[PDB]
Design a protein around this ligand. Structure first.
Ligand SMILES: Nc1ncnc2c1ncn2[C@@H]1O[C@H](COP(=O)(O)OP(=O)(O)OP(O)(O)=S)[C@@H](O)[C@H]1O
Ligand SMILES: Nc1ncnc2c1ncn2[C@@H]1O[C@H](COP(=O)(O)OP(=O)(O)OP(O)(O)=S)[C@@H](O)[C@H]1O
Ligand SMILES: Nc1ncnc2c1ncn2[C@@H]1O[C@H](COP(=O)(O)OP(=O)(O)OP(O)(O)=S)[C@@H](O)[C@H]1O
Ligand SMILES: Nc1ncnc2c1ncn2[C@@H]1O[C@H](COP(=O)(O)OP(=O)(O)OP(O)(O)=S)[C@@H](O)[C@H]1O
Lengths: 49, 389, 425, 431, 65
């Protein structure tokens, strides 16, 4: 039976599968919320340039 | 066994400096043997690093090749722990097409200073499946008002009480230590944090660095942040230029400067980028700012103890006669060569269906693999066959 | 048929069970000591627990160093990553040579990651969006019909592929990848002539979850995360338009990927297959590269590194006056185990010539083989094996199916070796 | 017209018989019997495409004809096999490394022959009706043998509307993609309207069945596949040369898929020839890369030409035979070109005269071959054209000895210019 | 130019000058190695550092609601 299946088509015994990429979860970079508040500078110290 | 990303490297046996509370080095401890004076100096330097009060102190570990300078550096790194920054580079890594040598050194310096920020978040949420919002928990049951649309995604968990941030039972506190380099790469672009991974940072401007230094000083004064000074390790510092050394001179004079550890294994040689001869390949003006710790060549028993520690690190059992033969080999050729003979002889014994490394195994590995001296001699014998003599 | 290259005859180290080298086996003759040492190194790579171990193949040109490295590769098999490299490849216009070395180190460490693949495939019965948080899509297979609530990303990829209805689609949930592989077969009979291709409707389930093993290297993860290509947000889309330059991947990305890989190894969804990095012509590396290799070999993550050099007392490149044994700094020679390759006797050269003749499908008479061995003794082994194909061509021109001595003489006269050419120069 | 009379225009091939024996003068190719025979053997080896990464060096004194041998090999090889010719100086780019440039040159020299079975319907349009409010339509096509009426789907209607098909157009339609390609306007319908329009030129009605399947062969190079697969719109870099350091893993994937295609009957590999002219301009790093680039099964046959002898290797202080390191010289076969005799020089001059279409007397041939032996062959070859122009100015038809002497006096060779310079050595700068 | 052997207080004197001027006056510190940049020419680096050693003080009456 197996030999007959192979004779009919080899895709019956082992299909060709789609080739796929490995999906890696995004890297989570943790940091303090105060870091993003850097370079903000104080209102009432910033003039109109 | 399962092979993890971290395998048996050269310095895997070193768990730290084997130092007493008085900093006196134990003969063998934490994977380090000998180098008593150098280990004591590394201990006092490590206490200086831990105290973190004096900025920009530079230490040079000098000695013959294979005397454990890099081993002392890795022991210092292991003793320091993961919470204080320890930046390790080779002198070659500052020669970049993305940035100048000055910029590479500046980044390495700012990767060694860490700012510690602790934040109070708000988290109470728990066991809820219902929809509008009321919450129920083994000890709590509550109702919350809402006037925005974020709940649609929340349907299909825990929220921030202040801003309503949504994400899949008390306030809880989080500590984040961020290096100065991270701070100025995050704030150099709109998505500059990506450059912390791709390396496409390209010469952060001095303006933003000045502003970030000012803001970090402000945070320190206001109590929001505390500075965790680290240590920058430059291995093979003789690969640096005269320009790089001159930059290091004044880079170490900032109050935001880490502790600098340098390793070099050469005598009076040419400074790269110049025709001048200096004691360590380092200009004398930089050596002026350095405390130099010298490593002594290992004795026979120190070599045998290192071989024992490396064998038990690699999980290979040798006979005593094999230990003496291998110690003789190490004293005759080099310590690294014997360290590698250990693994090769374990493999040869394994093929033999044996369990313990014998003298015959070490002889076989000695025949198969050559040291520099024997290969150089066999080369001299075939001098003409080799190319470009 | 397959093309015959200079190493196609090497199928292994030809070592028996005890590791002793058979005089001739697996396409290698002689170099028994070097072959035995390479067998020990093969066992080292298979042991899998030692990192950053380097070996140096030292010997004059023609002695089979690259042949032995490729024999090691054959012994390991295609499963283990064998990254071949030349010292001249470090000098990149985009990234620093240290980065090139680190990338080659990272692609010699291989990962086999078992991944669950979520597949939606079927005929699009309907496609109804909801303001744009939703798309309700009906998918029909032989097994049955199902309608699924999918993300705006999948909907908008569906719009990219332009799937309307009666279209057979293949959705990978993990990557958000949509493939419009054609219109359903039931609609072929609609028209005599239509401008599309019809595909039979899928015969499996609409929602299929499949476990597959993916072969990747640490460098693949590094490059993917340093040049992200997933995600559909506009900011990343506009970054995809940049010229895809190689960037100096930071140690932080590599540490993060190390953490991720360690987590995978703990979870049992990945296995590490550390391989070997082969740097041929290592003498081409400059002093900076060797001094970086000092550190790169101390890493607990490093692969097994094989170096090959044929130089005798060459100046180290970049040093301008420093003569080291193999063009390699002494401090690096202290970190390597040197395997020496010796010159060949006339008989070994004759055996190699016969093996090359067999691989190239060339019948050579005993007289021709002896003459070619004499030539190789006078000129070089490489010269003799090169004469075989032209000699066979001349033999076919003469109408003979074997290389006789006269054809070898003719080809010897037509072509020259380096020594004869230097003489006439 | 854009191809004028180049230096090697007369070279139509190697001029060898079936035994690979060189005929004295054949295919514009005089002398160099042994070198030409070696080139023929190498050409046979290239045609067989069986052995990969073979290197040949053509070595000789300047003007002995190494580049002519290479051009003859290219001409005899034909347009179908890739033949990339570069100068060693071309690998020094600001876009990419020398190793990258050499890899690209290697992969330009390998050709991938991709045969696909298409199904096209080709016929003469004798009727097309499109109804528009989904659109409806009908289309009748005919060959010489049969006519069929097609009920059009919306996609096919859109394709026809975009391609503006009328009655009398000869079109081919791809059954898979529905692409419409129109070959012209047909014998029967032909003339078209009684409106503004333009002139007319007509093609024949196709014969046989409308649907004829048919198998088409598409040829690419490995470099093209690399460039297309590297950059998501990297195809335009095949013209701009803006492909910086294609990743090694991408190339490994290309190689694996090409081998897979070959096993599965889709692709056929055509190994070509890479010709590095002036290979002494490569530095030691490039030679070291060449050493191992020739070990791959996807490596072409490498032809190198150099006139150096006992010269410094670029990037090093070492002296080697051809300016090429001895390790690479052991990897290749050397074809030596001998200097030219009096009669070979005269024959080459006659061939160049024929190529440039200049008649010149036998006395002129004697004088010019003497000049070529004394000065150089190339200088005499240029005197050919110069003297023809002088004769035409004189309003003659045959170039005489007097014209040759006139152009000898007008245009100097290196020896005489160097002498006159030596006399006034102080007037020239930085002596 | 502060000329003298190493360790004789040249940098200390420059920093003392900076202190005597106060943060009001812009003090731009630099190393001669900083002129070698992969992005701009040494002349541009020098010109920029000249630019940032001249300070500008803007007075504004800022009204807000
Ligand atoms: N700190 C040190 N203390 C004592 N000897 C040293 C020290 N550093 C180097 N040496 C000596 O210097 C020798 C060579 O050092 P290397 O680093 O291998 O090369 P090098 O010192 O730069 O010498 P060259 O030939 O000038 S490049 C060693 O074998 C030691 O004998
Ligand atoms: N012991 C051997 N048995 C069989 N083939 C060999 C042997 N040694 C060398 N060869 C081959 O002979 C040819 C020349 O050797 P290569 O290994 O390609 O060059 P090489 O001399 O090893 O390169 P290096 O680095 O200068 S030693 C190749 O086809 C090799 O496969
Ligand atoms: N059979 C031949 N073999 C070689 N050269 C020929 C032959 N027939 C004609 N030529 C001449 O070859 C010239 C090409 O330039 P030459 O420098 O003389 O030779 P070449 O082919 O360029 O090789 P090199 O590198 O210059 S020595 C043409 O102008 C012809 O006059
Ligand atoms: N006159 C001084 N009084 C007090 N401290 C000083 C004096 N001169 C130098 N120092 C300090 O001594 C150390 C060495 O002097 P530096 O100022 O760093 O060197 P420099 O002379 O300024 O520059 P160099 O070394 O000549 S290139 C520093 O910590 C200085 O602050």
């Amino acid at each position: 039976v197996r030999l007959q299946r192979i004779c009919n088509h080899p895709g019956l015994v082992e299909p060709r599968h789609p080739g796929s990429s490995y999906v890696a979860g995004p890297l989570e970079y943790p940091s303090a919320s105060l870091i993003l508040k850097a370079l903000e500078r104080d209102f009432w110290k910033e003039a109109d340039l | 066994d399962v092979t993890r990303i971290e395998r048996i490297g050269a310095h895997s046996h070193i768990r730290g400096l084997g130092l007493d509370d008085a900093l006196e080095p134990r003969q063998a401890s934490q994977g380090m043997v000998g180098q008593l004076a150098a280990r004591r100096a590394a201990g006092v330097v490590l206490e200086m690093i831990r105290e973190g009060k004096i900025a920009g102190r530079a230490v040079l570990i000098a000695g013959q090749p294979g005397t454990g300078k890099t081993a002392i550096a890795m022991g210092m790194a292991q003793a320091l722990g993961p919470d204080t920054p320890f930046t390790a580079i080779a002198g070659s890594e500052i020669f970049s097409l993305e940035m100048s040598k000055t910029e590479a050194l500046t980044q390495a310096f700012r990767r060694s200073i860490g700012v510690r920020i602790k934040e109070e978040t708000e988290i109470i949420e728990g066991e809820v499946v219902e929809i509008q919002l009321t919450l129920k928990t083994t000890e709590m049951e509550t109702i919350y008002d809402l006037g925005t649309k974020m709940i649609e995604s929340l349907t299909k968990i825990t929220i921030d009480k202040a801003t309503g941030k949504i994400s899949k039972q008390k306030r809880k506190e989080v500590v984040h230590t961020v290096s100065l380099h991270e701070i100025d790469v995050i704030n150099s672009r709109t998505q500059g944090f990506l450059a912390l991974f791709s390396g496409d940072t390209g010469e952060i401007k001095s303006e933003v660095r000045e502003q970030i230094n000012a803001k970090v000083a402000e945070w320190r004064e206001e109590g929001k942040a505390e500075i965790i000074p680290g240590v920058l390790f430059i291995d093979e510092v003789h690969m640096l230029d005269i320009e790089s050394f001159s930059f290091l001179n004044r880079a170490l004079e900032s109050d935001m400067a880490p502790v600098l550890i340098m390793a070099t294994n050469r005598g009076i040689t040419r400074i790269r980028g110049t025709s001048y001869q200096s004691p360590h390949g380092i200009p004398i003006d930089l050596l002026d700012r350095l405390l130099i710790v010298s490593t002594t060549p290992y004795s026979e028993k120190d070599t045998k103890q290192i071989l024992r520690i490396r064998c038990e690190e690699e999980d290979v059992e040798m006979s005593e006669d094999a230990y003496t033969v291998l110690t003789r080999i190490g004293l005759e050729t080099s310590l690294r060569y014997a360290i590698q003979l250990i693994t090769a002889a374990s493999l040869v014994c394994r093929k033999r269906k044996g369990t313990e490394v014998q003298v015959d195994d070490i002889k076989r590995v000695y025949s198969l693999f050559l040291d520099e001296s024997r290969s150089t001699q066999y080369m001299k014998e075939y001098q003409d066959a080799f190319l470009f003599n | 048929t397959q093309r015959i290259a200079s190493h196609s005859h090497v199928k292994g180290l030809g070592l028996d069970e005890s590791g002793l080298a058979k005089q001739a086996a697996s396409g290698l003759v002689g170099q028994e000591n070097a072959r035995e040492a390479c067998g020990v190194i093969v066992e080292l790579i298979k042991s899998k627990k030692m990192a950053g171990r380097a070996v140096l193949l030292a010997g004059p040109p023609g002695t089979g160093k690259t042949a032995l490295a490729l024999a090691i590769a054959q012994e390991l098999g295609s499963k283990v990553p064998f990254c071949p490299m030349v010292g001249s490849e470090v000098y990149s216009t985009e990234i620093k040579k240290t980065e090139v070395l680190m990338e080659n180190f990272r692609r010699a460490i291989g990962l086999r990651i078992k991944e669950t693949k979520e597949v939606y495939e079927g005929e699009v019965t309907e496609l109804t969006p909801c303001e744009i948080s939703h798309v309700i899509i009906g998918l029909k297979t032989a097994k049955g019909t199902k309608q699924l609530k999918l993300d705006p990303s999948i909907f908008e990829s569906l719009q990219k592929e332009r799937v309307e209805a009666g279209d057979v689609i293949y959705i990978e949930a993990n990557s958000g990848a949509v493939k419009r592989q054609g219109r359903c077969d039931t609609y072929a009979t609609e028209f005599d002539l239509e401008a599309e291709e019809y595909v039979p409707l899928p015969k499996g389930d609409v929602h299929k979850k499949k476990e597959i093993i993916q072969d990747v290297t640490l460098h693949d993860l590094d490059v993917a995360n340093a040049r992200p290509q997933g995600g559909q947000d506009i900011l990343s889309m506009m970054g995809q338009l940049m010229k895809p330059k190689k960037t100096e991947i930071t140690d932080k990305l590599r540490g993060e990927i190390n953490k991720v890989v360690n987590k995978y190894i703990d979870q049992g969804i990945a296995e590490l297959v550390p391989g070997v990095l082969f740097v041929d012509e290592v003498h081409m590396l400059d002093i900076e590269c060797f001094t970086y290799l000092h550190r790169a070999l101390e890493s607990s993550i490093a692969p097994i590194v094989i170096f090959a050099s044929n130089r005798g007392n060459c100046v180290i490149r970049g040093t301008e006056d420093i003569t080291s044994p193999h063009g390699i700094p002494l401090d690096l020679l202290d970190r390597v185990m040197i395997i020496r390759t010796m010159l060949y006797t006339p008989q070994e050269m004759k055996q190699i010539i016969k093996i090359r003749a067999q691989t190239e499908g060339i019948n050579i008479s005993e007289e021709a083989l002896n003459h070619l061995g004499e030539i190789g003794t006078k000129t070089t082994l490489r010269y003799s094996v090169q004469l075989l194909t032209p000699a066979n061509l001349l033999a076919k021109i003469n109408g003979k199916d074997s290389i006789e001595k006269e054809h070898v003489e003719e080809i010897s006269e037509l072509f020259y070796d380096a020594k004869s050419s230097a003489k006439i120069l």
